[PDB]
Amino acid sequence: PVYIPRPRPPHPRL
Amino acid sequence: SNIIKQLEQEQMKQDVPSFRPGDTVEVKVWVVEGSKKRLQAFEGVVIAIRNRGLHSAFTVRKISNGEGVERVFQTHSPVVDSISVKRRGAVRKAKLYYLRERTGKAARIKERLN
Amino acid sequence: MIQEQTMLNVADNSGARRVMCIKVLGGSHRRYAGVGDIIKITIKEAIPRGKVKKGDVLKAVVVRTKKGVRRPDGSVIRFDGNACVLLNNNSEQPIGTRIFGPVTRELRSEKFMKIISLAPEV
Amino acid sequence: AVQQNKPTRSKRGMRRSHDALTAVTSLSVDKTSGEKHLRHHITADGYYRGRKVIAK
Amino acid sequence: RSSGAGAQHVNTTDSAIRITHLPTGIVVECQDERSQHKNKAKALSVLGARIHAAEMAKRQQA
Amino acid sequence: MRHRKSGRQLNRNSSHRQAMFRNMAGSLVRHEIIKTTLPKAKELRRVVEPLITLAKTDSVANRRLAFARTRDNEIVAKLFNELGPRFASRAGGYTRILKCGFRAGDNAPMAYIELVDRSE
Amino acid sequence: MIGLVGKKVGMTRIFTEDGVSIPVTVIEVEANRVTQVKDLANDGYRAIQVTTGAKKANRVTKPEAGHFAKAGVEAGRGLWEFRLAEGEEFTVGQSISVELFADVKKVDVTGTSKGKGFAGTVKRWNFRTQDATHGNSLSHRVPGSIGQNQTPGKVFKGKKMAGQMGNERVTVQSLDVVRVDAERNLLLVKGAVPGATGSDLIVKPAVKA
RNA sequence: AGGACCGAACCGACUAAUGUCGAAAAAUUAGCGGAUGACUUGUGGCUGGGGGUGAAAGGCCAAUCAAACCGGGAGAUAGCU
RNA sequence: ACACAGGUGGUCAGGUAGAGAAUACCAAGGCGCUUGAGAGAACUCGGGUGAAGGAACUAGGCAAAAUGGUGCCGUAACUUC
RNA sequence: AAUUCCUUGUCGGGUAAGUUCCGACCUGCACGAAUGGCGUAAUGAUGGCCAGGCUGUCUCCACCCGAGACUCAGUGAAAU
RNA sequence: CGAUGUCGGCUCAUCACAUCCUGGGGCUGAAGUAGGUCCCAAGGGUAUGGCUGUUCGCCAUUUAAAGUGGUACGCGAGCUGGGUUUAGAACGUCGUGAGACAGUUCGGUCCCUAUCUGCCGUGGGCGCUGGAGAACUGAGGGGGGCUGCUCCUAGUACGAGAGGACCGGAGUGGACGCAUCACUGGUGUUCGGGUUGUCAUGCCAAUGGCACUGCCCGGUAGCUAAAUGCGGAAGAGAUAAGUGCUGAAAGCAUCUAAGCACGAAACUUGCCCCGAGAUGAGUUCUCCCUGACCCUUUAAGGGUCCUGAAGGAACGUUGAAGACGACGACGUUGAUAGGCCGGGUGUGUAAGCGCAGCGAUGCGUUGAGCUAACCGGUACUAAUGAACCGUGAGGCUUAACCU
C-alpha cells in the first residue's frame, strides 16, 4: 500500500 | 375438544342474566366470616366483561367512601349469588377503562331507555 | 405491590399524608409486600395537628393496593390508590382513631383487630 | 479471530468431508409421456400425473 | 487502599492505614506517604498525642 | 418461538407485504394463472380464497367489501359475474399449485398458482 | 403400584362448594392393556410394559405387529414400562382402567416439556440482564464472564450457558388428585403438568408418601 | 436600533449509539448553539520554513508540524538491535 | 485510490393544510438506490408497548420518557430599572 | 473556598441515613486588593446539589415490528 | 520493555476452612431464655440505601447470617471510564525562569468477523458384525439439599418473682429452581372500531395509500411473569466430634487393645434427569432373507444372471419439534397442511334503505357486520402409480445337550 496508517492508540500502562 | 366442552357445560349455570357492559349491576355475593355465612351486597358500574364460557368474568367498578374499588367477579362461581341490573347504561364501547381516571361528574353515562 | 421508595397515602387520621416505604419487613431479599404485611416507612408530609411529626421512621401495614389482592375464588380486588396504617414499632396498636376507606378480609388475623373494627366497609 | 498457526491440508479435508453435495437420484417417469422429472414437480413440457395441467 | 493520586502503587498497594482505639473511640487516619511503616509510626505518634491530649483535657476539666 | 402462529413474514414489512399480496391476488384474478415463488403462493392461498368466498354471494355491500381489497374496478368486475356463477357448485379450495423447477436467477422454488379453470 | 399413560387434553378449573376454585388438568386415560410381563428369570427384574391409544393398520410395522400379536391385544401408539412393587401381579392382556387412581391421594406426573428451542442464558438459567445504558455497547443480554483467568485456563464442566430449552423429561411431583371419572375415562389432577395439549403423560403414584 | 428572542437555508460538532480490517484515513442517526452580524461563502491575488500565520492550541502550512516536502552533502553518525 | 451514505456556487420553483423555503400528501419530472429466495434460533441495531413503584440504576436524570402551537388571565426574589 | 495536608476539622439545614452542597465558626501548612479582591442583573451544549412531573434506567424484564446473524444460488477478502 | 491492560463498579462464578448462620457435641464463673470459649462438619445461604471513583469505613433499617482469603490480591479478544498515568487550562507552594508537585479540582477517541484447547447444545460416518423395529435394566455422570414466624405440647419443666424450655407435630411465609396459561395482567404492527392532514376510486356515501403501527382504544390464539401449583424431605447403611457397655494389660480403674450399641444439613443411597461409543459396546420381544453357476494365489477370495425381503432413505403436506440437521403426525385404505360450514371469542349497532332535523347528526332494520393464530366436522385443493439404499439365513475353537 501507499499509505500505512498510524497504529492504534495503545493501552496506557504508564 | 368435546371432552373440555362436556366438562364445562355440566358445571355452567343456566340462569345467567344477560347484561351489556355499562349497566349499573348490583351483585350479592356469599362470604364466610368463620361460623357465619353472610350474603353481602356490591353495587357499581360494569366496565369490562371477559366472556370465556365457564371461565367468564365481569368487572364491577364501585366508587366507595374515599377512592374507587374495582373488583372482578366470576360468573359461574358459587361464591356469587345474585346479579340484578338496576340501570341500563348506553355506552357504545365494550371496555370502559377510560372511566378509571374520571371521578365525580365525568363518571356517569347515558341511559338506554329503548 | 408495595416495594422500596413507594409513596403511600395514610389511611387513618394519625396525622401524616404522604409516606415513603423504605423496606419490606419480614424475610430477607424480599421484593414487595402483600395483603397485610408489615413495612417500614418514613414520613414525607404531615398535618400540623398530627400526633407524629415529619421525619418519623416507623412501621406501617398496607391495607389497599393498586396491584390488587387475590381472593381464593379466582377474583381480584384492585384499589385506586395505595394506603397504609401506621403502627407503633413494638406493639402495633394503630395511632388513628378513625380510618377512611375499605379494607380486605385477609387483614383480620389476631393483631389488626383495631383496624378492621374501625373499618367502615368490609 | 487471529489464528496462532495455519491449519493443514488434512484439517481442510476433514472440514470439507461434510461439504459433499447429495444428489437426489430419484427421477420419476410420467404416466403419459414418460419424461424424467422430480418428485411433486412438473416436466419441461408441463406434464404432471398424465393431465396437461399447464394448458400451454 | 488509598485515595488521591500519583502512580500505579495506589491501585494495588494499600498505603492507607486507619487505627481505631476501642475503649476510647479514637480513630487515626493516615494516607500520607508510600510505605505503611512510615505511616504506622505517624499513626502511632498521632494515637499517643490524641490519647495524651484527651486525658490531659479531662484532667484539666476535673 | 411462534408456537401455533400463522402468517409468513417473507422478509418484508406489513405494508409492502399487504400491498404485494393485493397486487398478486389481482394478477391471479385477472390472468387466472401466474408463476411465482412457492411460499408467496402458499400465503396467496390464504388471500384469493377469502376473495372468492366473499364473491360467492352477489349484493350491494359485497361489492364494496370486494373493492376494499384489490383496489381495482376491473378485478371486482371479473368477480361476481364470471367467477361467481362458475365456482358456484364447488365449496372452497378453488386454487391449485404446480411446482415447476427452480429459477435461474436466484435458485428459488418456482410454482404456477392457478384456479380450477381454463376449460373455455 | 404402577403408573398409567394418559393424554393431556386442555386445562380447566373445579369450583368447590366452599368457594375455592382449584385449577385442574384433564388427563384422559385410555385402556392401558398389558403387552408383556418381564420377570426375573429372563431379565433380572419384574416389570410390565403396556401401550395405549389405537394405531391404524398401515403405520404399524411387522416387528411391532408381531410383538402385538404375541400379546394378542389391539395395536396402540407407543410403549411404556412400569416396575412392579412386589405386592401384585398382572397378566398379559389385562385392561387396566383408571380405577387404580381411586384410592391414592397424590400422584406424580412426568411429561415431555414444551420445546422452547435454542434459548439464551437469561431465559434458561434466569441470569440478570446487564444495564442497558450508561455506555453499554454490545453487552446487553450476554452472559459475560464464563471463566476466571489463566490459572484455571478453561471453562468448568456444568457451566450454566445458553442452549437447548425444552423437550426434556421433567417431572412435577406431588400433584393432588381431584376426581376419578370412569364413564368419561378422565383423570383430573390439581395444578399444572408439563407438556401441551395432546402430549403423553406418565401418571405414577407419589413416591414421597 | 440591538454583536436582541424562537426557529428554516447555511456554519460548527456538545451528548449517546452505530461503526472502529467502517458507506468514509472524523462519517451517519436522534437531539443541539448561532442564524442581521466579532456571520457565512464563491472568484482572483499577497504573506512561507528557524520562516509565514495564529480572538493564542506551540495550533495550521496540501490526510505528515516544538520546525513541511523534494533533491544533494550522504553509503552522515550509531560503544546500540 | 471505487459505479463511495462525504463535500460543491448561482437561477426557476406550483396544489391542499400551514405564520412560513419548516413539516404531511401530490402535479410537471425522475426513480425503486446492480445480490435475491427461504426460516422467523441465541445474540446485535433502529423502534413500539407494558401491571406496581417512580431514579431506588449509575461516578453522574447518561440514554430514554415527559412538556411543546394560537388567543386570554396572571406572573415572585433581585436588578444596571 | 477551583486554595485546606491533618480533615469526613466543628455547628445547623436538606435526606430515614449526605467524604458532595448551602450558611457560618477562623486553628489562613501555603487567600488577598490590576500575574486584582469582594459582590453583582442578565447570560452559559459550564461544575455540583435539591424539589415537582415524567418514564424499562432499575426492581425484573416480557412480547412484537424491520435490518443482520441461520440455510440455499452467484461473486468473494483480511489481519495472522 | 521486537508490549502480560491493572483500581473501583455491573454480570458470571470456582475452591480451602483458620465457620457468619443453620447441624451434632464438651467445659462453664451454664436455675431456664439469652450467653462466653472450644472440637467436628463447606451440604445450602451469606444484605438494602446516603457519602466517596473509591475497595474499606461510618450511618439508617432488616436478617438466621451481612465470614475470611485464593483464583494475574478473579473476570475490558464479557461492558463502561469515575479515579490513577497523553496532549488544554486554573488555585496554593518551590524555582530569576522554562517547568514541577502520590495537594487537589474542570474536561478528555478503550480495536479485533474465533485457527486450537475448553464450555453450552445439536448432527453425519462407522462400530457393537446377518440386518431392522421398539421396550428397558444399568455402569457412570449431572440437578437440588436454605429456613423464618405462629399454634399445640405449654405457661409445661426450670425459676422467690420476672421471665421462660428440650424433643416432637401442624399451618402460613421469603428466596431459589421447575412446570403451565386454569385465574389476573403485559405483548399481541396479521382482528375490529374512533379520529386528524392530504391523495385516489369521474363526484356524494363508502373504502384504500402515506405521515413511527399516523394518533389511539381494546383485543383471538401463542410467549411471558407480577399469576398458580410443585420441591428441598421422610427412611436406610457406613461414620466425624462426642456419649457409652463389657473389659484385661496393670486384683482397682478404663469407650478399645478383642467386640458390641448410639451418634450430624458432612459420604453413599433414597427425590429427579442424561446415559450400553460403558469399543467391557448389555438384556428381552418381534419381523425378514432357505436361487444357480463358472474362475481359482481352494483365500472369512473375486466376478456373472435372477431377486430385493423386513426395514431405512429421498419428495410432499406439516407441527405447542426446530438456526441447519435431528424428532413427531400424515401421504388418498386420509383429517397432515391450506380452503369451506357451524360454534366460540374480540371490536362493537357495517353498507344500503326508511324517518326526524335548514344542517352537523340522531333512531329502526341490528347488540348487526367483519373475524387472524381457536374448537368440532367436511377431501373442496395439495400430499401420485412409482424409482433409491439395504439381501440368497450369517466366520474359527471348545464344552454341555439331541441324533
Name the resolution in angstroms.
3.8
SS3 assignment, position B5: helix
- Closest-CA residue to F72 (of F25, F17, F32, F14): F25
Which residue precedes each gap in chain D (C to N above 2.5 Å)? none
Torsion over CA: G172, G175, G180, G184 (sign): negative
Give strand letter and number of the nucleotide nearest G132 (CA to C1').
J57
Alpha carbon G54 to its chain centroid, in Å, reads: 20
Torsion over CA: B58, B60, B61, B66 (sign): negative
- Tell me which chain G residues have a C-beta less than 8 angstroms from the C-beta of C72: 19-21
Fold category of F13-115 in CATH:
50s Ribosomal Protein L17; Chain: A, (3.90.1030)
Helices F38-54 and F14-31, axial angle in degrees (round to 10): 70
- Closest-CA residue to G5 (of G80, G94, G108, G56): G80
The residues facing E18 across adjacent strands are: E29
Torsion over CA: C11, C14, C17, C20 (sign): negative
G27 within 8 A of G6, measured Cβ to Cβ: yes
Q: F98 in contact with D at a CB cutoff of 8 Å?
A: yes
G26 within 8 A of G12, measured Cβ to Cβ: yes
Q: F104 in contact with G at a CB cutoff of 8 Å?
A: no
- Closest-CA residue to F112 (of F17, F55, F51, F31): F31
Give strand letter and number of the nucleotide nearest G66 (CA to C1').
K286
CA of G65 to nearest chain F CA: how many angstroms apart? 34
C79 within 8 A of C2, measured Cβ to Cβ: no
Chain E residues 2-61 with Cβ under 7 Å of strand J are 3, 28-29, 31-32, 46
- Tell me which chain F residues have a C-beta less than 8 angstroms from the C-beta of G116: 1
- Closest-CA residue to F22 (of F1, F3, F2, F50): F50
Distance in angstroms (rounded) separating the CA atoms of residues B54 and B74: 9
DSSP assigned state of E19? E
Distance in angstroms (rounded) separating the CA atoms of residues G76 and G38: 19
Task: State the Cα angle at C37 between C34 and C38, rounded to 5°.
Answer: 140
CA of G55 to nearest chain B CA: how many angstroms apart? 20
In chain E the first and final C-alpha atoms are separated, in Å, by: 41
For B99, list phi and psi in degrees, rounded to 5.
-75, -10
Q: What are the sequence ranges of the domains in chain F?
A: 13-115
E50 sits in which H/E element? helix E37-61
DSSP string, G103-162: S-SEEEEEEPPP--EEE-HHHHH-PPPPPSSSS--S-SS-----S--TTT-SPPTT---S
Q: How far, in Å, is the CA of B108 from the C1' of nucleotide H41? A: 66
Half-sphere exposure of A9 (CA within 13 A, CB side): 1
Name the domain count of chain C: 1
Q: Which three cell numbers stand for residue F17?
A: 407485504
User: Alpha helices of chain F — where are they, by DSSP H?
Assistant: 14-31, 38-54, 60-68, 73-78
SS3 assignment, position E47: helix
| Burial of F52 from C-beta contacts in 10 A (0-12 / 13-18 / 19+) | buried
Whether residues G117 and F3 touch (CB distance < 8 A) is answered with: no
b/e D9-28 (16+ beta carbons within 10 angstroms → b)? eeeeeeeeeeeeeeeeeeee
Q: B39 in contact with C at a CB cutoff of 8 Å?
A: no
- Tell me which chain D residues have a C-beta less than 8 angstroms from the C-beta of F112: 42, 54
Q: How far, in Å, is the CA of G123 from the C1' of nucleotide K55? A: 33
In sequence order, the 6+-apart residues with CB closer than 8 A to the CB of F22 are F69, F70, F71
Name the domain count of chain G: 1
Q: Which three cell numbers stand for residue F16?
A: 409492502
Torsion over CA: G1, G7, G8, G12 (sign): negative
G50 within 8 A of G79, measured Cβ to Cβ: yes
The residues facing C23 across adjacent strands are: C40
For C11, list phi and psi in degrees, rounded to 5.
-75, -40
Residue C10: CATH number of its domain: 2.40.150.20
F21 within 8 A of F44, measured Cβ to Cβ: yes
Whether residues B65 and C102 touch (CB distance < 8 A) is answered with: yes
Distance in angstroms (rounded) separating the CA atoms of residues F75 and F82: 11
Q: How far, in Å, is the CA of B53 from the C1' of nucleotide J6? A: 79
Residue D19 lies in domain: 1-56
Tell how strand C83-87 and strand C6-10 pair up: parallel
DSSP string, B33-79: -SS-EEEEEEEEE---EE--GGG-EEEEEEE-SSSEEEEEEETT-TT
Separation in Å, CA G72 to CA C8, F96, G64, G67, G92: 73, 45, 12, 9, 9
Q: F61 in contact with G at a CB cutoff of 8 Å?
A: no
Separation in Å, CA E5 to CA A12, E31, E33: 16, 11, 12
Q: F5 in contact with G at a CB cutoff of 8 Å?
A: no
Give strand letter and number of the nucleotide nearest G137 (CA to C1').
K79
At least 3 CB pairs under 8 A between chains D and F? yes
Residue G132 lies in domain: 1-209
